[PDB]
Amino acid sequence: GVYRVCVSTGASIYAGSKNKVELWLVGQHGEVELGSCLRPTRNKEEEFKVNVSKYLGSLLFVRLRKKHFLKEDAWFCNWISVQALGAAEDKYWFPCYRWVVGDGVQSLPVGTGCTTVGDPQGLFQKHREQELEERRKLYQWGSWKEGLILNVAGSKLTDLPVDERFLEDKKIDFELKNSLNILAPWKTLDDFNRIFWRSKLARRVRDSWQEDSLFGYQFLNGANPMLLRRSVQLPARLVFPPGMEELQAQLEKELKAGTLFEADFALLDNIKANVILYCQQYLAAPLVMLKLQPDGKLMPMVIQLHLPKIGSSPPPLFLPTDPPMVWLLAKCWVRSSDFQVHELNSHLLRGHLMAEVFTVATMRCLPSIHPVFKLIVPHLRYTLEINVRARNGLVSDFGIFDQIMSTGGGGHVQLLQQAGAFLTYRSFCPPDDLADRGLLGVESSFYAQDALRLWEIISRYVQGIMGLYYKTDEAVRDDLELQSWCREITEIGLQGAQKQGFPTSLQSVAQACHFVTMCIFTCTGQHSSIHLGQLDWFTWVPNAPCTMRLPPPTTKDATLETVMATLPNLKQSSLQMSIVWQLGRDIMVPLGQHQEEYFSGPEPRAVLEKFREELAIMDKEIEVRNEKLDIPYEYLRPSIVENSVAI
Numbered sequence: 001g002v003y004r005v006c007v008s009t010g011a012s013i014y015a016g017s018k019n020k021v022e023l024w025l026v027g028q029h030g031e032v033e034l035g036s037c038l039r040p041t042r043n044k045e046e047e048f049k050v051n052v053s054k055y056l057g058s059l060l061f062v063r064l065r066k067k068h069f070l071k072e073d074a075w076f077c078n079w080i081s082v083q084a085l086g087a088a089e090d091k092y093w094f095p096c097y098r099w100v101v102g103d104g105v106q107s108l109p110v111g112t113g114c115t116t117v118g119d120p121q122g123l124f125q126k127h128r129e130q131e132l133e134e135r136r137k138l139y140q141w142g143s144w145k146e147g148l149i150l151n152v153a154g155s156k157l158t159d160l161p162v163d164e165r166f167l168e169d170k171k172i173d174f175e176l177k178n179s180l181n182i183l184a185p186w187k188t189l190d191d192f193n194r195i196f197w198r199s200k201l202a203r204r205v206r207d208s209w210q211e212d213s214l215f216g217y218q219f220l221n222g223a224n225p226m227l228l229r230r231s232v233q234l235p236a237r238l239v240f241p242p243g244m245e246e247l248q249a250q251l252e253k254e255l256k257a258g259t260l261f262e263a264d265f266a267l268l269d270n271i272k273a274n275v276i277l278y279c280q281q282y283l284a285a286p287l288v289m290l291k292l293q294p295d296g297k298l299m300p301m302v303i304q305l306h307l308p309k310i311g312s313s314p315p316p317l318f319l320p321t322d323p324p325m326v327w328l329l330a331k332c333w334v335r336s337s338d339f340q341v342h343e344l345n346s347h348l349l350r351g352h353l354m355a356e357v358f359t360v361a362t363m364r365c366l367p368s369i370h371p372v373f374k375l376i377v378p379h380l381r382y383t384l385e386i387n388v389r390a391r392n393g394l395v396s397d398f399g400i401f402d403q404i405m406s407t408g409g410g411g412h413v414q415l416l417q418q419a420g421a422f423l424t425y426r427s428f429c430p431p432d433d434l435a436d437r438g439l440l441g442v443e444s445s446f447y448a449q450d451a452l453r454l455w456e457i458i459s460r461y462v463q464g465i466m467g468l469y470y471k472t473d474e475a476v477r478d479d480l481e482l483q484s485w486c487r488e489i490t491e492i493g494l495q496g497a498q499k500q501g502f503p504t505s506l507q508s509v510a511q512a513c514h515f516v517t518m519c520i521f522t523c524t525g526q527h528s529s530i531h532l533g534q535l536d537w538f539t540w541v542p543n544a545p546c547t548m549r550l551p552p553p554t555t556k557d558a559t560l561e562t563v564m565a566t567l568p569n570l571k572q573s574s575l576q577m578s579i580v581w582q583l584g585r586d587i588m589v590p591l592g593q594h595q596e597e598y599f600s601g602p603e604p605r606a607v608l609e610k611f612r613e614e615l616a617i618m619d620k621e622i623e624v625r626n627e628k629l630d631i632p633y634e635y636l637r638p639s640i641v642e643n644s645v646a647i
């Protein structure tokens with residue numbers, strides 16, 4: 001029959017090629033040779049009619065060979081579509097979206113997608129098994145540091161598969177005034193103003209960072225809402241020095257009313273503090289007890305800076321009533337500890353490292369033709385590149401972290417190791433996490449609200465696509481590839497995460513959907529909610545000290561002098577700004593807005609379109625409620641929630 005074959009080439013600087021490409025149309029009933037059909041032009045679609053006097057039937061693949069003359073010259077193929085003109089059948093979609101290197105022959109299956117069980121005739125069996133074999137050879141596990149969840153093999157960017165590298169245009173675009181004031185005073189809090197300020201919220205932070213309300217507000221809607229939780233009982237670490245009966249009563253009252261909250265940084269205990277230029281840096285594992293007030297404010301009640309040691313008197317408990325500098329100092333310690341835990345655990349580990357696990361596991365276990373692969377890939381874009389770059393300058397030995405963070409120098413890795421034990425399945429699912437932390441219902445928490453709504457929207461999207469390939473729980477149980485995928489993640493990538501609540505197999509449609517939703521959310525909502533706020537809360541050093549120069553107080557006689565001596569110096573404060581500012585000044589793909597089409601059918605596309613509709617409505621509604629908000633919570637607005645962990 002007569003077909004309109006169309007080939008799409010990438011837009012990146014090197015997507016084009018000077019080599020001719022041969023095409024073959026292979027259907028269920030025979031195939032044909034089209035020969036050298038074109039010479040790939042960057043950012044161009046090449047269409048041409050061809051008449052084959054043979055009956056192919058339904059097309060299964062499109063074979064291609066890039067014949068090179070003297071030099072090989074790579075080519076980035078987006079896709080190939082062949083439309084049978086005249087016959088009333090659908091346009092055959094052959095998704096590629098990858099680099100074609102070498103004179104080797106490749107086959108692109110039609111984008112309908114299917115599971116081994118969903119392909120009884122085994123038409124794509126040979127292909128998927130060999131694609132996976134090649135996948136496993138290209139995407140291997142590794143370990144940047146012992147004791148952490150696994151990452152992608154190698155240590156340099158060049159060790160990543162060609163398809164994982166930034167497209168040239170993004171690579172080039174992605175890649176002191178303070179030193180003038182190098183002879184400027186450093187005696188008072190106001191001196192911190194020499195930094196520079198960059199946004200509406202940041203300025204607010206600079207203007208009211210000493211506010212107990214703003215302080216406690218951050219536990220809910222700030223850059224790190226992953227720590228706070230409703231107190232079921234008083235923390236066992238919260239032991240009282242003599243004479244603290246009054247406070248203890250106020251605590252009991254709030255507990256009984258169920259408005260007592262806690263933010264415990266015990267994770268930081270026993271972690272090696274940095275030594276920058278032979279000077280000792282300091283860390284603290286504080287505990288903050290707060291009360292949710294009827295007017296909607298979360299206010300700090302007490303701050304304990306040290307964990308009580310068994311066999312010795314309890315450490316002091318700081319109160320809002322203590323001298324200004326004493327209380328202010330205790331808060332700075334909490335702000336500093338949050339910065340460390342935020343960056344290492346909430347951001348790096350829970351966001352970047354988790355995503356990488358899902359990425360590698362996916363590339364190793366799910367074939368391009370697989371439904372789940374098509375659902376997930378968009379959300380894995382550029383994760384390996386960014387993470388590799390992080391381990392080659394940010395968290396690497398002698399890197400940026402080691403240069404300015406109090407956890408840098410070794411402790412950061414200990415924290416990352418110790419933190420693995422807390423990577424529980426439930427903590428990655430808002431409905432579950434928010435419930436366990438008693439945040440469900442707390443109307444002051446825009447994070448919890450937006451997190452829940454966004455989760456539901458993604459859940460429906462996942463269900464909608466999964467529903468078209470798994471009509472029964474039995475269908476998911478029998479999916480060997482899906483099962484191996486689940487294991488590659490849980491048992492391998494996460495190193496026995498089954499003990500932390502992760503599934504070792506998916507036994508139902510509802511369970512598989514939940515798992516895919518968990519992955520998709522982690523790579524988008526989870527990361528965005530934690531990444532986006534950095535520029536707003538971490539640019540004003542006092543609100544997030546990268547390091548501390550004096551150990552935590554054990555008495556209540558701190559002076560402004562004590563506060564300044566503890567807080568980062570000019571150089572450090574400046575270095576903090578640079579790192580945060582540059583790493584946040586954001587090109588990008590909004591959640592659900594990926595252009596590449598992996599599915600062929602009209603239904604898969606309808607589900608995606610609904611997903612987009614809902615996200616748009618959520619975005620608009622958030623924008624609105626935010627206009628009537630004191631401090632707008634924007635970290636979960638789909639318009640800015642990224643489609644993958646790519647920054």
Ligand SMILES: CCCCCCC#Cc1ccccc1/C=C/C(=O)O
Nearest residue numbers: 343347348386390579580583584647
């Ligand atoms: C690949 C990003 C890894 C993020 C987690 C490790 C870190 C860090 C860091 C510390 C202090 C200031 C800024 C950064 C990173 C900022 C950013 O990624 O936007």
Ligand SMILES: [Fe+2]
Nearest residue numbers: 347527531647
């Ligand atoms: Fe990030």
